[PDB]
Amino acid sequence: LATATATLHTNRGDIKIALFGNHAPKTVANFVGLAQGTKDYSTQNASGGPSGPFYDGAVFHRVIQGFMIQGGDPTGTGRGGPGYKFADEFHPELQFDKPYLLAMANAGPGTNGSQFFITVGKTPHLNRRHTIFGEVIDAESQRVVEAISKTATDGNDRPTDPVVIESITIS
User: Exposed e or buried b for every residue in 14-33, given b needs 16+ CB within 10 A?
Assistant: First the structure.
């Protein structure tokens, strides 16, 4: 299925994710573009600057145990994005019937920006509400995602110890 690989190098470990470029071409192209600094975004990146890799220094600001981990907001608040919205991409072969799925966070139809999430369980109520565009490959990466999901959080589901995406390798 996969047409490319992404590794989120976090301060709590690496997460190798297979990207579904043939099922969600625009979403994957958007994620890869931001990751590498190739996409033209109009806000600031997670390092506060105008250009380069968009997600470096980004946190997972929303972690809910046995549900998912969500990040990719340059402000780390949950209200931010790269300065644009774009369409969802639902594919009949992609649904939330396994854990460890990379998908886009959103505020309802057509609101994808930069925020994404990784599930830690089956979440069928998210079917046809969130674009799936990836899946974590190896068992070790699944463990990092698991450990991140179990981290201590405040009353808003924000981790007390910041989980930081230090950079992202594409390959």
Answer: ebbbbbbbebbeebbbbbbb
